[PDB]
Design a protein around this nucleic acid. Sequence first.
DNA 1: TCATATCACCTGCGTTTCCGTTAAACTATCGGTTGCGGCCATATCTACCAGAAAGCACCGTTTCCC
Length: 128
Amino acid sequence: QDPERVKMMKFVKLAIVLQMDDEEELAENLRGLLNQFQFNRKVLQVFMYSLCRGPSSLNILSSTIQQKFFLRQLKAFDSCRYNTEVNGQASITNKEVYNPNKKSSPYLYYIYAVLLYSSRGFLSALQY
DNA sequence: TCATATCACCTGCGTTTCCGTTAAACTATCGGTTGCGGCCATATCTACCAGAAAGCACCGTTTCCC
């Protein structure tokens, strides 16, 4: 029932999940936090650092599910950046964005380039 | 005037036995009220899918090369 406690509880759960090789559990915990803290930089770094080593982490990033998930958040950021409806964009849960110079989010474009690269889409990786 | 026996009686007193009354501890449901959770509505996220513009490979007519 406490918003500060549920936030803390999800991170402590993830930290224990990182020490067991359950790929699906890790993938679902990460998806939960990314759905909650939309566009957040510290969360996007926890995502990539939680995926630093082995075939288990490459399986997460190379999955088509992850490519579609990040495409939808990138479209949602572009919606906040230009004030227009983008087909298939995720709902704008983080309305607190302040980007007066219309800049990209380097972290979203980077993680999308990584998802394509880590799935042998080299032409697509060079574009982003 | 007391002390036995025997019969009609019938009407009367107030006797004499199992049932009824006031009210018990313990008994069998069942109700006024307590807390606990389905179907279904919504905005959002997602699985399974086809179609286009474009890839890409199987193929053999061509003609240059064994």
